[PDB]
Amino acid sequence: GMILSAEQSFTLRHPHGQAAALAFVREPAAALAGVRFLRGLDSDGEQVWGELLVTVPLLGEVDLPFRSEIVRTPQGAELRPLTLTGERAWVAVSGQATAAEGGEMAFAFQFQAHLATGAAFEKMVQAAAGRTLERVAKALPEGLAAGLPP
Template sequence: MQVQTSLTCSISHPGSPQDALNFIQDPHQSLAKVKFIRDLHIVDGKVRAKFAVNVPMLGEQLIPFQSIIHPTADGATLESTSLDKPAWAEVSGKAHLEGSEMKYELHVTVHFEIPEAQKWGGNAFLKMVEATAKQTLDKVSKEFPRALKDAANA
């Protein structure tokens, strides 16, 4: 099963253009206020982290992702990479600076390996998992711009 979302947003940076560029190119700084991202690590341009997802009856689940950040003259791109896990996310996008505005474009696809439902209870569970995944991605779409703004103004 796959569930995906895309979002675009524009955030003003209160500092200089160089400060804004540094913010875009440093995931530790730009993602500092994103509450649904856990265990953020950046090594040799590889960004590794986990999305925290609240699943009914299962509690908080952590969905890993790994992307490669490529700094550019006016921002950065994020290239998704695959993971060999039962549940994982592809996260890709780009960010660039236009004056004092930071323009973001983000694409997230969550992959779940779920066995075929054999009975109506299994079908209900699959629908619940899909609904939870969609709610999580809606949350990402709503909270991500706010978290970026909070981090930029910190």
């Protein structure tokens, strides 16, 4: 299950404190936008959406959309993925974030690729999809850190 899913967890301190940390984690479209491998980030305050790019031979860059519900929690926020239609591949982006007193933030993100429904062809697509999920996951800390004041 590690090919079509990725996981990333890390911490960052918000230098302006808990209130600033809470606000930061509660506006995901803006925070996620710093991750370059996420494209077309947008939000209406209730949900956030965008796309990941999977590069394959001949077709080139293939966009897989995602859309998640923004849930405000007592300690921060969560992203809960919405199920998209099955006619093309898509991604489920899940996340949990907390802000402690002093402004230290804890992040956990999970990505699941949902492919549409020979063996050689499937392995190539799955490999390309997996590389994309991992590239986004590994880039999350840098991306969120870019949205913090120095």
